[PDB]
Amino acid sequence: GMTSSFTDYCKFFNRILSEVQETQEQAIIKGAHLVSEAVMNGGRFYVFGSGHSHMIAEEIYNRAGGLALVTAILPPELMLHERPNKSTYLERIEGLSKSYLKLHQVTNKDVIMIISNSGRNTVPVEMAIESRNIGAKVIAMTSMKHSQKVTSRHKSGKKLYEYADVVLDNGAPVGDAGFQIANSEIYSGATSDSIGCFLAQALIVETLHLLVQQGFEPPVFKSSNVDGADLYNDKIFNEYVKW
Amino acid sequence: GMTSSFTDYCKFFNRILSEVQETQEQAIIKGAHLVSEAVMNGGRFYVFGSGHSHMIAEEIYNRAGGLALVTAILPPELMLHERPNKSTYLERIEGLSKSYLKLHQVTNKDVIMIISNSGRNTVPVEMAIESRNIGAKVIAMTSMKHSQKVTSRHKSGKKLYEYADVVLDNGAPVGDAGFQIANSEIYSGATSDSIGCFLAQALIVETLHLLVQQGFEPPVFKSSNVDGADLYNDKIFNEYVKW
Ligand SMILES: [Mg+2]
């Protein structure tokens, strides 16, 4: 009768996560220094991704344990829900990222994290370029494997990682679907968002640690089950959230 | 802990992930049977979550390694980007899920996965009730710890997991921000989405594995780096993607 892929997929996943945990500590720390420095300087933390990568922006925005100084840049035209494949077309268009930075009034006091697995398209690369132009620090989350292997589709000829102050490597294999289904040529089990979400939280957790060590009391959304969560959350929403 | 939280956060996280992997295998297998049987019987796999939970639907929808018979139900009004807190309010409203189900013409041949940490609010509970009433199979992804501790806000006085054919436990602690920022009262490091994504992926992998074993050749999107990826993808999109 039928066998199970679960043990195998767990092992596949756990290796990637191990390697990530083992190799990204220094990056996480340097990224957290960038973010904490910005916060302490009156700055914000902008987060952006295109396609599926946008979920890492969502992940650290407006939730329990969430730093209220985080603003997700979430253009729905680059998401998944308006029409299938729309975001694939738009990712190639020059001038979008620059408009977005303008709309959100990102300044040189700020930090931005840009998530892209391949880091090869116009939108994410432009976002890094225009951010540098503004003078904001850039964190890139990416698949260093995938991205090193691909050719830029941005006019610079460069990739996202090549414009970052700090790179966070999600460890995803080239393709982001690297688990081969037994007795077939079918590949699945993408790791970029699971591991990407882990890393995004680790960054925030590290940032908060750095702030606390320094005697900064950062605005962080309390989970409903803590006493007085709501009144506190309403207070800090009002004082802090920029969308 | 003195300077960095990263090692501690990894341990914290790996603990939860280990527990999830140690315990959810039978539930993964059961869910994959539901989905694989539906697929072979002319059905689809719908996926839905409110608030941050929506990203789990996104995760297995329209992507490399993705099963083309997955349709995410993604009402923007219950996402994060329109305005802050809108999803929180709307999740408590009667009648939305019944509309969504109609709009997506969900039928008795299908399966639906509903993701909610607490599983206590009207939207996900109403969705679960109506989906079984139609005749669909229901998979719930929830935090069993959180869900069991809280009272239901739905008029039936029951919770999401109580209405599902299979439950996936994301292992998240009550409140979903359980990691203490060393030597403060600040808590962070939400795990429901990182672990949630891994679970969604494990389910699909297992579903594909069951299908291949039964000689069914499923439509799975190929990644960019694969030969013929784009034609094949257009083909299966055209044949299968409903939205
Ligand atoms: Mg999303």
Curated annotation (Swiss-Prot), chains A, B:
CDD domains: SIS_RpiR (cd05013). Pfam families: SIS_2. The lineage of its organism: Bacteria, Bacillati, Bacillota, Bacilli, Bacillales. Gene3D superfamilies: Glucose-6-phosphate isomerase like protein, domain 1. Belongs to the UPF0309 family. This is UPF0309 protein BH3325. GO terms for molecular function: carbohydrate derivative binding. Residues 35-218 form the SIS domain. InterPro entries: RpiR-like_SIS, SIS_dom, SIS_dom_sf, SIS_GmhA/DiaA_subfam, UPF0309. PANTHER family: PHOSPHOHEPTOSE ISOMERASE, SEDOHEPTULOSE 7-PHOSPHATE ISOMERASE / DNAA INITIATOR-ASSOCIATING FACTOR FOR REPLICATION INITIATION. SUPFAM superfamilies: SIS domain. GO terms for biological process: carbohydrate derivative metabolic process.
